[PDB]
Amino acid sequence: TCPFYKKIPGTGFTVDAFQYGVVEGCTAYFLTHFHSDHYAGLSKHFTFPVYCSEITGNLLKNKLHVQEQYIHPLPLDTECIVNGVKVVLLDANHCPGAVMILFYLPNGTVILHTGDFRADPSMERSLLADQKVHMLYLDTTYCSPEYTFPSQQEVIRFAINTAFEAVTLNPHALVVCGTYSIGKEKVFLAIADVLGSKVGMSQEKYKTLQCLNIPEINSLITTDMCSSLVHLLPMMQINFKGLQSHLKKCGGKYNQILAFRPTGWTHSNKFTRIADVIPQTKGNISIYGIPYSEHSSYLEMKRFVQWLKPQKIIPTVNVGTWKSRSTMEKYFREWKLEAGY
Numbered sequence: 001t002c003p004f005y006k007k008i009p010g011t012g013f014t015v016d017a018f019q020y021g022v023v024e025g026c027t028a029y030f031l032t033h034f035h036s037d038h039y040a041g042l043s044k045h046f047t048f049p050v051y052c053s054e055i056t057g058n059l060l061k062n063k064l065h066v067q068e069q070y071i072h073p074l075p076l077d078t079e080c081i082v083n084g085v086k087v088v089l090l091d092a093n094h095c096p097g098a099v100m101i102l103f104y105l106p107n108g109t110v111i112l113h114t115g116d117f118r119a120d121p122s123m124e125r126s127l128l129a130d131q132k133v134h135m136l137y138l139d140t141t142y143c144s145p146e147y148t149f150p151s152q153q154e155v156i157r158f159a160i161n162t163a164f165e166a167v168t169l170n171p172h173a174l175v176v177c178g179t180y181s182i183g184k185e186k187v188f189l190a191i192a193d194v195l196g197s198k199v200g201m202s203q204e205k206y207k208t209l210q211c212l213n214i215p216e217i218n219s220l221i222t223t224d225m226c227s228s229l230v231h232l233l234p235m236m237q238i239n240f241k242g243l244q245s246h247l248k249k250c251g252g253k254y255n256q257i258l259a260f261r262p263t264g265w266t267h268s269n270k271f272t273r274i275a276d277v278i279p280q281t282k283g284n285i286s287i288y289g290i291p292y293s294e295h296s297s298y299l300e301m302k303r304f305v306q307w308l309k310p311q312k313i314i315p316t317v318n319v320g321t322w323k324s325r326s327t328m329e330k331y332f333r334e335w336k337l338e339a340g341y
C-alpha cells in the first residue's frame with residue numbers, strides 16, 4: 001500500500017505515488033521528475049490530474065502518451081493554487097525538469113518535499129529563505145559520511161581534457177558515453193563541444209532530448225551516427241563485449257574507443273582524487289567510470305538541513321531496513337545538536 005512518506009498530511013495530495021492504483025482520498029498526484037522509480041505506473045490510461053513542471057509534462061505527453069487534459073504543468077518560482085492549497089515548484093538541481101515542492105497548509109504548517117535533489121548553497125536564496133519550513137521530506141540517497149564526491153564542474157573538466165587529448169593524439173578514436181535515463185546531459189554535450197562534433201544517438205533517445213527545452217539543442221545532437229564522433233549507447237552496452245561489437249558496426253571508420261560511464265558513487269571515492277582516476281583497458285578499448293552525481297553528497301545534505309532547521313525530517317530513500325532508518329535518525333540528531341535547533 002502507499003507508504004506514509006508519499007502522502008502530504010492535511011491535503012488530498014500524493015507525491016511520486018503512481019504504482020498503487022487509486023489511492024483512496026487522493027485528489028491530485030504530483031510528479032517531481034521523469035525517472036522510472038518515480039513515474040512507475042503512469043500511462044495513456046491515467047485519468048487523474050498530474051501536477052509537474054513544463055519539462056516533465058512534455059515527457060509525459062511524448063514518451064508515455066498521457067492525455068493532455070490530465071497534465072497540469074506549473075511554472076517555477078511562482079505561487080500557484082491547487083485544489084485550494086498554495087504550492088510553489090523550485091529547481092531541484094537533479095535532472096532536467098526536476099522539482100522540489102513547497103506546500104502551505106491551511107493550518108499554517110509549511111512542508112518541503114525535495115523530490116530527488118543535489119543540495120546547493122544557491123537554494124538558500126530561493127523563495128525558501130522567506131518563511132519557516134516545519135516538515136522536510138528529504139532525498140537521503142547518500143546520507144552517510146563515506147559519500148564524498150567532487151563538484152560537477154571538476155568532473156566535467158576532467159572528461160573534456162581526457163577526451164580532447166585522446167582524439168587529438170588519435171583522430172580515428174571514437175568517444176562513447178552511456179545513458180539509461182534523463183540526467184547527466186552535460187557529460188556528453190561538453191565532450192562533443194570540445195571535439196566540434198554533434199552527439200549521435202538512437203531515434204528514441206533523440207526524441208527524449210528534444211522534450212527538455214535545452215537551448216540550441218538542434219545544433220548539438222543528431223540521429224546520423226556516421227557524421228558524429230561522440231556516440232551515446234545504453235549503459236548496458238558500456239563493457240568490452242558491447243563496445244567491440246559497436247566498433248565492428250562503424251565499418252573501419254575507427255580503431256580505438258574511449259568510453260565514459262557516469263556512475264553515482266563507487267568505493268574508489270574514499271581513496272582516490274579526480275586528478276588520479278584511471279580506466280579499465282582491454283586492447284584498443286578504454287572505459288572510464290566518472291563520479292558525476294545528481295544527488296547530494298553527505299556534506300551538501302548536512303549543510304542544507306542545518307540551514308533550513310526543520311522541526312521534523314521524513315526520509316524518502318533507504319527507508320526499507322531498520323538499520324538504515326536508525327543510522328539516518330542518528331545523523332539527523334547530530335546535526336540538530338551541532339546547530340542548536
Ligand code: NI
Binds near residue numbers: 033116
Ligand atoms: Ni531521480
